[PDB]
RNA sequence: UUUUUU
RNA sequence: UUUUUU
RNA sequence: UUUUUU
RNA sequence: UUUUUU
RNA sequence: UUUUUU
RNA sequence: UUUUUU
């Protein structure tokens, strides 16, 4: 009768929301690891140029171990900073791992310990001299810049050391857009990002690193999830307004705002597509339960919090549920009625399971063949049903 | 059914302003460089003309740092005010630079350091010689004003000293309006600017700089990033009324007329044709979530501030999001109105990857072939039926 | 009439606070002096210990600037916290000084600049080299602490590293208490300060810096200012609880309880035996002029703030008007009372010009021949007349 | 007038509650040592054994680090709990030292490292071995226990390991009464708590520490700070009920009630003998300020919160303004009054420099001489004159 | 600063 | 201005 | 710490 | 930017 | 990202 | 799970 069909939303609803409440015990932690940080302890511009090229050979170095990468990545990310200590140790929210920060003190052609010369030390130097030997013998003497004067690059001014930090860094975080989502088709939004980033004078195009290295940090940002997650929260801290923000911020948030809602497509082009623009073909009997899906969807995400965004980057439980294949049928007629709108979509590779080609079919026809779509008319135009007919007419 | 389509407003809504809330830590603070900034000490005529062709020789010089090519700049902004100092420090909001105000005090051919002579101050004697021949060397000879008379000119006169650098500070500030939007196409509109002050006396003709000199201007400008904040809070600053306006300040304030919502043309031009002047073909199942997305734009820009007009050349992040690319279909519809309607629309560069030509096509035929577009009549025009015809008959 | 005699003591309070309202302004700015502090870069032992020996001699050098001298000071002062330089930073108050803070980096004999070797770093170089020459050229071949091996003496271990500064601390934070007061006549309440926190433990004895060395940073901190500001806001944020309190923290609140109230000696000593202890010799016709007085006392003090303990220390100016002087016979006779009732009261040397010798008297027969003193006895010790007799019979 | 003398006492209430209110920040951070703790991984009663005897091996040892020490007290402290490192975590509150809780795992005659045996292990394993021959050379053959029987003896069963591992945490616990008060004056009290127990057979007399351990032991408590804030945080937990207590919990919680108000014999005498026992004598005019200060102080300490009991455990510098030298009059009197009327007061050195024998004699005179001291009486006691003059009859 | 008993 | 104890 | 009666 | 009348 | 006029 | 544009 009427009741029912009504207890079937409120169903769904608590169902969605089953058992997402009260808070965890401390038995389930994980195992973490030891992850050694070099920062720079000064402001001098020569050392952290050393200490930037440095992590830069430790990363491309081949028999440098996963976690000795992850240190180098954490140094050269918040290299930018004054501070980088502090950055770091206050910026971190990954149960995994733990960060022991290590100020660098002086440099030496590697990192000189200084405590406790001769014991526990002269090893650890060793390990670092092999780790930078193999990383300049593995490359066919390229070095990590496409120019082989910015390697051998004596830096004393800090505008210098400012700049070439910056290039760095923007480099380094055009990748996480594509890191995980395509990292094999990537290359050629991050060549227009570094083309974009060119043309407004924010890089200074000399510090530009090669592709090989680009290729090798992008394998291991998508191994590692910690890294995703420092970048993630420094992406959500230079979010929040408030405050004046450097050239560094500024570039960190511009990716960001490229970086945003990366890897669920899917979910929000069904939004916009299928759900607005609304096109009398919606409620025909196989689409009502797709939309309570998907409102239940729009509840989770705003239930989620600032973290929403970047679900795929974190690789959240709950991003399963925003993908499609719990609601093929609205999803394929969004994406139907998409492809034939927006000429960008269409390079999107949806060729899955649940492809529902007759409701393809009929979302190309309602994007074109099925009306001119004249929605609830404020102004009232008692005299354009000629106009109509003329739009329709193309 | 009725829930829904509201919900999806909404959801939109509150994902425009998504993580936009609360204040941001310092632990996020850029590595800041030194900045010397030569500024008058005294209000002496001679010494203020010798400050100002210094900063022009530096400006002009091929082997300034840049470092020193800011900190003339900043003498040269500075220059009209009493105390440039003062004006300096109370309107100086960049966390990127720090400023080391320097009094020059008396006026050597280059400067006088005039502190602790022989000690760490005869290299820099050397080093602004230096700086001196380089750039007179540099040019073929060429003083950077166009009248070689300009440049050795002895200035004695309160008054002559005041028209003359009114006229540099007006040939400055007439490159901020196309520094970073098109720095190519400019020397148009920069000359029409120039013509327009000349015509009204608000300068002197005889002060008037070389276009190589501005297009080297013109490059340091787009470069740098902290003269461009510097500027733009001076034009805030200005902008706000309240007290008596000098020269000075009303031929800045009168230039920022025309530098306001600079590189945002398209936005502004899809609300202005687009969305005003309400066309029938709107409300046509392809443009609600357009609309939806030029309202939240709309939103965003009230909540930014006073520095929303300026948000190019402080390369704001949110710039990205008011860009076209997320709304191309009604700003392709905007465009092709305006190009049809106004005669200077069009001369704007865009050839974008999303241009739609069917919506600009349509557009197109909206602005002349649509009809006359009679709106709500407070005024009873019973009669003016024929009117209308008359109007749409051409 | 009955008006008379309050319209006087209303208009001795409105005089006390006369003109001390409103908000000064900027233009009574004193001239800013630059000081150079070097501060540990990183935490390791040996770099530290290297520095508080650096700063020690430099201290001790007399071929020393003043400069220099603060420098040192302030180095030493903040070598116990984890981050001097965001200690210094955030602690300091004082708009005679401005404070450069110098990460020190590496360390060499004496400090490495390690920014533009060459350039503007080799006199300084020269300079420092001389300045440890001369202070040990200086004396007698005496090293700064009483044992001589503590002088060469290699640290490797943490926690050596962290007695020996808290050693240092210590034998400098009891200087404080009489350094302006009576800097001549200590060395004793000095080494009854030391000898306590030996027989404590709090101190390791073996970095016991010699008397020397002791006299020439008293008499430093004597003619210095800035330093006394330092240590006072120091004493002043250690002295609000809340946080956990380390061993350099409790050492330096002890230490602050002793040095509180110092150089007043006069005016809580008038309080506490002249106006406490109610003797019937108080109305008396000489004294209710002193009593309105030392009530509007009583209110500025309660008015100034919490600096009002460390007003001799920071030298305020309202620290005469707390001064003998104004009232010289309630003072006499609270010291009259004082040296016949406290038997430490008597060494407090009092040979003032307003001694007033016959209220003196006064006072000493006040508290012995005057009568027992019976005050207002909540419990009704209606037998305790013989009690009374028996009590004053001695 | 009536005014004043309320002022004051408002004055000095003030006074006292001056500066100690707000929130510290985090720039007066005491540096942190590391401290390497062995816990027991298992529940097997020889690894717990073995540990224990490694422990108490190490304290005796005189050639150990003293961080070596405080790991082998915190490990010897945390023995009786079956989880030493979750007691450890959840129970420290030292800012000056961190602590790195280390399984132990499996046991050898010192201990496995069992962490990539060879690297940076084998070194440890000799540091361990030469700890273990120093401390058994430095004895004369003499084992820590009184018995020699006691330290060759091998445990297998869980009921002799938990009582010797409760006669080792009593006999330790033992020493916090009297370590920091007047250390070389034990023996005596820490003999009588050892017969008690005993005689209650809460400990087994057989595993009996020597002499010259405890000696040892006390005065490593006494030099280290954060083994005694462990031990008093130990006593603050264990001192709050709810829960079921264990025999260790037990022991230790009647410990404490001895440990509890020690080193503060003077205020609390001070109040019990002279404030409370009210005596006619009170009021004399020379006890007015010692009453107000004694009132502040009870205000103070009720203010200061849990901690106040173990004010001199933890060395509190809140400490030194409850000493007597603020009060010497009252709290003369008091003790005189203690003397005559406790026969154990009088063990009590009080031979301070502010003795004041007059107020002394005065209350030795009080005490026996003065009156009965009939006090308000509920009860009519009409016939009772006879009854009082018996009683002062003696 | 502290030196009793409990 | 200041010269104790704590 | 405790040493009665009940 | 401005080019009338008043 | 941006390329008009004002 | 993901593969557009921005």
Redesign the interface.
């Known amino acids: 009768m009427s009741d029912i069909f009504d207890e079937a939303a409120s169903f769904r609803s608590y169902q969605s929301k089953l058992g997402r409440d009260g808070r965890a015990s401390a038995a389930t932690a994980t195992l973490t690891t030891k992850i050694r940080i070099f920062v720079p302890?000064?402001?001098?511009p020569?050392?952290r140029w050393e200490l930037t090229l440095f992590a830069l050979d430790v990363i491309r170095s081949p028999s440098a171990a996963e976690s000795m990468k992850i240190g180098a990545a954490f140094t050269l990310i918040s290299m930018?900073?004054?501070?980088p200590g502090?950055?770091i140790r206050?910026?971190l929210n990954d149960p995994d791992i733990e960060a022991v920060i290590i100020?660098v003190?002086?440099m030496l052609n590697g990192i000189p310990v200084?405590?406790?010369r001769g014991?526990?030390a002269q090893?650890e130097m060793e390990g670092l001299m092999r780790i930078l030997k193999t990383a300049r013998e593995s490359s066919k003497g390229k070095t990590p810049f496409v120019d082989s004067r910015a390697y051998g690059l004596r830096i004393?001014?800090?505008?210098t050391?400012?700049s070439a930090?910056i290039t760095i860094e923007a480099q380094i975080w055009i990748l996480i857009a594509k890191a995980v989502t395509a990292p094999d088709t990537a290359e050629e939004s991050e060549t227009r990002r570094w083309a974009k980033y060119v043309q407004?004078?924010?890089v200074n195009p000399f510090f530009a690193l090669t592709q090989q290295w680009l290729t090798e940090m992008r394998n291991l940002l998508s191994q590692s999830l910690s890294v995703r997650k420092f970048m993630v929260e420094?992406l959500?801290?230079?979010?929040?307004?408030?405050?004046?923000?450097?050239?560094?911020?500024?570039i960190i948030?511009?990716i960001?705002?490229?970086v945003e809602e990366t890897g669920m497509a899917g979910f929000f082009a069904t939004?916009?597509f299928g759900?607005?623009?609304?096109?009398p073909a919606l409620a025909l009997n196989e689409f009502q339960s797709d939309?309570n899906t998907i409102?239940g969807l729009?509840?989770l995400?705003?239930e989620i919090g600032?973290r929403?965004?970047y679900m795929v980057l974190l690789e959240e439980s709950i991003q399963t549920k925003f993908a499609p294949g719990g609601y093929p049928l609205l999803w394929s007629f969004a994406m139907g009625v998409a492809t034939t709108?927006?000429?960008?979509m269409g390079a999107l590779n949806i060729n899955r399971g649940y492809l529902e080609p007759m409701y393809f079919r009929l979302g190309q026809k309602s994007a074109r063949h099925h009306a001119?779509?004249?929605?609830?008319?404020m102004?009232?135009?008692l005299?354009?049903n000629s106009?109509?007919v003329?739009?329709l007419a193309?």
């Open positions: 302890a000064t402001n001098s020569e050392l930018y900073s004054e501070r502090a950055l206050s910026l100020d003190g002086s200084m405590e406790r014991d526990k090893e004393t001014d800090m505008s050391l400012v930090v407004q004078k924010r420094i959500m801290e230079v979010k929040k307004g408030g405050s004046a923000k450097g050239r560094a911020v500024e948030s511009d960001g705002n490229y939004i916009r759900l607005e623009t609304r096109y939309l409102k729009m509840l995400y705003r600032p929403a965004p709108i927006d000429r960008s001119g779509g004249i929605d609830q008319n102004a009232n135009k005299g354009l106009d109509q003329a739009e193309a």
